[PDB]
Design a protein around this ligand. Structure first.
Ligand SMILES: Nc1ncnc2c1ncn2[C@@H]1O[C@H](COP(=O)(O)OP(=O)(O)OP(=O)(O)O)[C@@H](O)[C@H]1O
Ligand SMILES: Nc1ncnc2c1ncn2[C@@H]1O[C@H](COP(=O)(O)OP(=O)(O)OP(=O)(O)O)[C@@H](O)[C@H]1O
Ligand SMILES: [Mg+2]
Ligand SMILES: [Mg+2]
Ligand SMILES: [Mg+2]
Ligand SMILES: [Mg+2]
Ligand SMILES: [Mg+2]
Ligand SMILES: [Mg+2]
Ligand SMILES: [Mg+2]
Ligand SMILES: [Mg+2]
Ligand SMILES: [Mg+2]
Ligand SMILES: [Mg+2]
Ligand SMILES: [Mg+2]
Ligand SMILES: [Mg+2]
Ligand SMILES: [Mg+2]
Ligand SMILES: [Mg+2]
Ligand SMILES: [Mg+2]
Ligand SMILES: [Mg+2]
Ligand SMILES: [Mg+2]
Ligand SMILES: [Mg+2]
Ligand SMILES: [Mg+2]
Ligand SMILES: [Mg+2]
Ligand SMILES: [Mg+2]
Ligand SMILES: [Mg+2]
Ligand SMILES: [Mg+2]
Ligand code: NA
Ligand code: NA
Length: 551
RNA sequence: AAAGUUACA
RNA sequence: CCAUAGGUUAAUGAGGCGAACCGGGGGAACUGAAACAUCUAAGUACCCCGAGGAAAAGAAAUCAACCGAGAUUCCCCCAG
RNA sequence: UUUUGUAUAAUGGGUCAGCGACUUAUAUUCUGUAGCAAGGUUAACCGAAUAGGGGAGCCGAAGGGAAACCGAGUCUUAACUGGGCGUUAAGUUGCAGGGUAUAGACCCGAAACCCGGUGAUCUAGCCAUGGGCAGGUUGAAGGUUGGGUAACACUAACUGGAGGACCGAACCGACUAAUGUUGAAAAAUUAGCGGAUGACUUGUGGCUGGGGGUGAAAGGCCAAUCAAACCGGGAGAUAGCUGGUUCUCCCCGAAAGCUAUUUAGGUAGCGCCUCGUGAAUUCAUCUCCGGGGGUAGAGCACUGUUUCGGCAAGGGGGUCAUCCCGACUUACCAACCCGAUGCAAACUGCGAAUACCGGAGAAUGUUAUCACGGGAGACACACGGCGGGUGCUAACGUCCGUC
RNA sequence: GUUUAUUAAAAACACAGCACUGUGCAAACACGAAAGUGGACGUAUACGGUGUGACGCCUGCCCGGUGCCGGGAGGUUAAUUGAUGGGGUUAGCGCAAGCGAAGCUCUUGAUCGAAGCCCCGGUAAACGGCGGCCGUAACUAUAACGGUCCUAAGGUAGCGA
RNA sequence: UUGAGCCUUGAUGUGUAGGAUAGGUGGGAGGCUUUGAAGUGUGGACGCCAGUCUGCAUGGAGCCGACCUUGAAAUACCACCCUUUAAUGUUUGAUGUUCUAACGUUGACCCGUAAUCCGGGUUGCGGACAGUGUCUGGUGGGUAGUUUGACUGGGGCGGUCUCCUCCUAAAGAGUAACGGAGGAGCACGAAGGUUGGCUAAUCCUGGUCGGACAUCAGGAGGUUAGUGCAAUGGCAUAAGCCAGCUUGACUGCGAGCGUGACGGCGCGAGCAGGUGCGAAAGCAGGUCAUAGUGAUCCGGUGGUUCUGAAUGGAAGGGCCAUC
RNA sequence: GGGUGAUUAGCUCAGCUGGGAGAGCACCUCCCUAACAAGGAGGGGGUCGGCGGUUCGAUCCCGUCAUCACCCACCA
């Protein structure tokens, strides 16, 4: 069984001397499915950037087999805002389109005999060969089939005027149109809804080539992965099994490491007590034991686990009238997202906003924050309400600035409502508890980017929160910390998310989008929402179709 | 399940 | 009945000793390195086996450089 | 002899006579001398063999560059106005001598390491075999006969003769003292002392052998030797350590410092010594001239420390609305400004004498100066004067500078 | 009883007794390149090693450390095997460049890979270990008692200048 | 019993539009089935739930193309086929059980032989285990060879060991002590280069929250400030502070010096080539200076046909830059 | 004589090359109770040993002294 990829002694060093990856020796075999786990900063995206060939700085040797295609989807897929849907899409088939245009230019040869045959007719064969390498002529059908299978927006739509989920779908389609042999995915379900994620995971299970996927979720991982690469601090640990068994193994590993560190502390204290005694005569003391103690005094890497410190500052006191919408309606062109929506938000409530992609979830936040003007108006907030909004996109932070400068603005004392707070203490409240204040925004990882985003955008101190997909790149630990912080909140919050479990653990009012632009509002949590649906239900259970890619 | 004590004419 | 091992009798040799030299089987350490462990001393001292008047080697599956020389051994250079 | 320094009460020598320590291979550099000279010279070897042949070679006349390569030039560099190394000075082979290298390498001297053998006639254990233990005590089990008991159990007397049992000779030891310590004796004698039928003692003969044995275990014993026997060899181990180093005269004449050191008592480069060669009013002294100081002394503008006055903010405890504006007390702690007065290695708005650096001028001085080359020794210093650190303004203390 | 022949005869060694442990016999163990011997012409009521040391009353708590015993799941892991990638050479395609078949080579090293170690239990007549500070009762004299920190556990019986 | 691979035989391929599950080109015409059907009843499998594939039963001659309005055409073969899958083979690999014939036997019997040695022969029992050889991981004071620094008011213990600043240090340099005080093992693509511009600390007076001290205004003062970090020396022409443009934090050299015992270290005008700033004169080969460090060996990386053990390459060397 | 460590609320102790400074029980009030204990609710405390120092911060960093706790004083 010839492998597909190999890494031997692969090591990476980041600023100062930090071995994110140390001695990672691995082989990737045909038909494999690997899920890469770890905390927010472990080095998963680093390892995939190495596997994509983008990073060659590493120590060791990492290489794929020759003439195998690696399709790399990062966790920051960039697209051309000028481009429309088709203008961004065809770049994945640009060879065929460019060659076809060249054929159109060449066809004037047989009209005008200028440099007739010995100069370009021979190259016409090379052009027809590059068409033949693909289907080429039946290309519009390929594009239509891909768009149908991935539920892409119509090609006339622009890219800036696109929802985050559909943006990720465009990136997925442009990646998979290349038709590679090894997929590298960096959180491929970042902004996807339930149907999109289910289709993607079925496709991944069907994929013939190798798949290496980074995921902070567990159910999609149980679906797709064949084995897990833990990727702890420094070292990568393979594992055969499911997420819960791997979790058990991980707790056992961390408990053993904690016990060994405690024993090390014990032995070091004992030997220090020995070192701090006198010679007692003209006898040994001994340099061998001194050397043993000096080498025993070493350094161990503590886990940079976020855990429960996510600091949501308390806003101003909130009256009973918080938010009210009456007959809200919004449409774009001919497709309408919200139609005759009315609801009131009692104080203290967490509102789980759910629905498919581009259904209007983010545009609702735009109206509430006042950046968009509804057709049917009647959005209102109580006079005590102070709004703090967290966007679906992090594209507002200066990647040059450091963490502390970007969060705090450079002022040593930070004002949060009534109380002045030390900026360094406030930043450290968001797990940047060391010299992590010095890291650059661009050099931060995706999960650290989300944490810094929350830190910068919760400082306004509003007692109404408008969080749009707040747990995008976060792992389970930061997710739990955020859930606890949201629970210990005096004000009220509206959270848009696609994590059903995270939304269920905190939501008190469900705002769910449906077809034909109806936004059903339900006061209650997800358990009683499901119970209400069961009480007044409809008889069927089959959502998907799982269309195809090939042919 | 827990439930101790509290000087006399 | 086999046959072999074994036994018996003959003839034929060799045993042991000896100074060095010679071929082989094993093979130190002190010392030097200003310590020492790679390294050196040194394949030396020593032990053992086997010859001979010498012994070993010896007649290219050797060198050399498109010219060539022609088995082995020893001496002087090459060259510290 | 060793030392800073010895009559030293530090070492060595009783004395005589004899012996006793810088040698010999090669190789290399320098000096003298001899021969030839841009040449000199052969080695092995042949040889009627100190000749004569033999020129294989070696050194020299050309260097530069890592090299290719170029060449009285070359290298560097894109190139050098450049710069480094060379060109404008004879070598070579003997002989004698001074060094160095390898050999024991000036002589003597370890404790040790390795190799091969000799030892269990001493002593450790064990094995086979066969001897020794005067004399006297105590009385175990068991047994018998009676009492007993249903039978036992038990009990008495008699018996019996156990025991790493008791006392004590031979025998085996070795606790105490004295003597003896160039002894009667390289461990004993004398007077006492312990065991003395046992894990005893003893004869003869065996067996275990050196990182091995044996050990009722002390590192004990293994031929008067044992934390690794003895004999022979490697072997003249090695010894930065000690000792010793032998005839005479003449000339010059040190150092005990710096730097480095697995280095401090060793060594290396430099300083200082000597010999040779070559060179300049080269060097030294004094006079004059041109310089830089930040020392002694002094001073208090600076950094600090100080006293005393005069102005005096502020600061600490009471008299009050023991919140405000503070409204009033210091026989005041107190730097800030001024007037006086001190102190300072790490203070300076000042500042010598000397010393040092350079120039000129004589006189004087066996060139005293510098460079190169051969040979060293020395790198433990001592005290005294002057300037100081340290110490106690101690030390024949210790550490620097200078004489 | 033994011991430092030759300054130590003792409280030292031994000892009967005790315990732990190994050992199923071609025993463990020891001497020995080996053969083979002892153990033993014995056979777990036997033999070896270790500690303690008649007898009497006893021998408390700690398995965290070191060792030993058991476990096998997972991790790390040797020699082996030599996939894969890279390079050297060159028949040719080019005779300007450069590429490069087959072979042969240099290197790199996928896959396979046991015991140990990590890990999980046990074991102290295995080697070993067996706490602080503060307050508190008719005098502060002391604390039966209490608070708290730490530990693997905090020294029990009995002895004690 | 399995694991893996390979060859066959099957089975399988729901987009939209389309008659309805359409893999790809085919390449061709009609074949299929009658060697018994286009079906009904029945059983399993797949099932993107439409459905097409299937073992059967009497009945056994009709299903699609061809026709085209779809990007494409009609399981209407064998294909070498792609995708998944399942079966018999095939190799191999693992584990297990049985066997005997290697091997063991310190079981019995027989012979050599008048011998509990040894050998041979029968037989029993184990048995490809055990055991040994080579290679290899672990353990291994059982044994062996060694190491285990120096200074030091004796040694040990404590402290120190390299570099920078001041004093000791005696007005040139240098100058010791286990003398007296402190620091370094870096920082900076600006905090470097230039060209312009600018001048502090502290105090007094007036001024909204606002005072002992924030920002403002004017007066004294005159560097008591500042310098990336110790101390010393220096700095107004600022070496201090601000801004524009920038990369001289250049490459090859280098008269001449200073300082070292040397290794080495430092300063440097000027020359050549290119550059930045400035209108120019000019300045710039790092930073106000003095700390911020490590010889050689060995090896790594890039460049250079300098070398290349017959020749052409190459390996390995050298040179340059660097780790 | 030399060396080391500790100092944090009333007590015993945790405390990030910074971030009012924390835990048990003590203390305060209120419930519960005839009344106390125990139990339950609320609450407050601080020289971070002290003058010192590179610092965006000194509790943890920064020489020192103050005290109590140790350790060593060997050949001699
Ligand atoms: N140049 C850099 N210098 C210093 N730290 C860096 C640099 N680049 C990245 N890092 C750090 O390396 C860490 C690893 O980041 P990385 O993106 O690999 O993590 P991740 O686990 O893959 O993230 P995520 O799951 O959130 O996408 C982060 O903490 C990041 O800040
Ligand atoms: N300016 C616009 N013109 C046209 N269409 C627009 C415009 N802005 C947004 N849309 C579209 O309208 C829909 C609204 O989507 P929106 O960004 O509000 O979030 P969502 O789709 O509800 O959520 P999510 O961000 O999670 O996908 C999307 O389909 C989006 O592409
Ligand atoms: Mg040796
Ligand atoms: Mg030596
Ligand atoms: Mg030695
Ligand atoms: Mg022959
Ligand atoms: Mg006398
Ligand atoms: Mg004398
Ligand atoms: Mg001569
Ligand atoms: Mg003998
Ligand atoms: Mg007597
Ligand atoms: Mg005898
Ligand atoms: Mg011997
Ligand atoms: Mg001898
Ligand atoms: Mg020798
Ligand atoms: Mg004289
Ligand atoms: Mg010396
Ligand atoms: Mg002196
Ligand atoms: Mg244990
Ligand atoms: Mg085990
Ligand atoms: Mg040893
Ligand atoms: Mg200027
Ligand atoms: Mg220039
Ligand atoms: Mg210009
Ligand atoms: Mg080369
Ligand atoms: Na990532
Ligand atoms: Na959106």
């Amino acid at each position: 069984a010839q492998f597909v990829y190999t890494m031997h002694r692969v090591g990476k060093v980041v600023p100062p001397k930090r071995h994110i990856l140390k001695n990672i020796s691995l082989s990737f075999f045909p038909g494999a499915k690997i899920g890469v786990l770890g905390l927010n900063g472990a080095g998963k995206s680093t390892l995939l950037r190495i596997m994509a060939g983008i990073d060659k700085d590493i120590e060791g040797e990492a290489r794929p087999q020759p003439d195998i295609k690696i399709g790399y989807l990062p966790q920051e897929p960039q697209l051309n805002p000028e481009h429309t849907v088709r203008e961004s899409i065809e770049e994945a088939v640009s060879e065929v389109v460019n060659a076809l245009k060249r054929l159109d230019e060449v066809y004037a040869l047989y009209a005008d005999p200028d440099a007739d045959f010995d100069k370009l007719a021979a190259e016409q064969g090379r052009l027809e060969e590059i068409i033949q390498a693909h289907d080429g002529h039946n290309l519009n059908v390929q594009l239509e089939r891909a768009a149908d299978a991935l539920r892409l927006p119509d090609w006339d739509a622009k890219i800036a005027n696109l929802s985050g989920g559909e943006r990720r779908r465009v990136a997925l389609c442009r990646l998979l149109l290349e038709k590679p042999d090894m997929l590298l995915l960096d959180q491929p379900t970042n902004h996807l809804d339930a149907e999109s994620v289910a289709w993607l995971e079925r496709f991944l299970h069907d994929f013939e080539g190798t798949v290496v996927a980074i995921t902070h979720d567990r159910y999609f991982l149980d679906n797709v992965a064949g084995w897990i690469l833990e990727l702890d601090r420094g070292e990568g640990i393979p594992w055969e099994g499911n997420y819960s068994s791997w979790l058990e193994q991980k707790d056992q590993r961390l408990a053993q490491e904690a016990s060994q560190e405690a024993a090390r502390r014990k032995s070091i204290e004992k030997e220090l007590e020995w070192v701090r005694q006198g010679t007692k005569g003209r006898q040994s003391k001994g340099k061998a034991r001194l050397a043993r103690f000096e080498e025993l005094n070493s350094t161990e890497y503590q886990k940079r686990n976020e855990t429960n410190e996510l600091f949501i500052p308390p806003g101003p006191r909130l009256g009973d009238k918080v938010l009210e919408v009456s007959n809200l309606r919004k449409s774009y062109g001919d497709r309408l997202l919200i139609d005759s929506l009315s609801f009131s938000i009692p104080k203290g409530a967490i509102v789980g906003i759910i629905g498919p992609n581009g259904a209007g979830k983010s545009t609702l936040f735009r109206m509430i924050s006042g950046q968009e003007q509804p057709d049917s108006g009647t959005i209102t907030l109580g006079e005590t309400v102070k709004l703090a909004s967290v966007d679906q996109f992090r594209d507002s932070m200066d990647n040059s600035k450091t963490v502390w400068e970007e969060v705090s603005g450079g002022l040593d004392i930070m004002k949060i409502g009534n109380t002045e707070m030390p900026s360094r203490a406030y930043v450290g409240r968001f797990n940047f508890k060391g010299v992590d204040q010095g890291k650059r925004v661009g050099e931060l990882s995706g999960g650290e980017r989300g944490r810094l985003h929350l830190a910068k955008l919760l400082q306004v101190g509003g007692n109404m929160l408008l969080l749009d997909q707040p747990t995008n790149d976060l792992d389970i630990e930061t997710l739990r910390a955020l859930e606890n912080a949201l629970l210990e909140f005096p004000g009220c919050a509206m959270v848009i998310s696609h994590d059903r479990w995270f939304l269920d653990r905190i939501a008190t009012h469900i705002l769910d989008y449906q077809d034909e632009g109806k936004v059903e509002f339900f006061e209650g949590n997800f358990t009683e929402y499901e119970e209400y649906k069961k009480r007044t239900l409809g008889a069927d259970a089959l959502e998907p179709k799982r269309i195809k890619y090939k042919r």
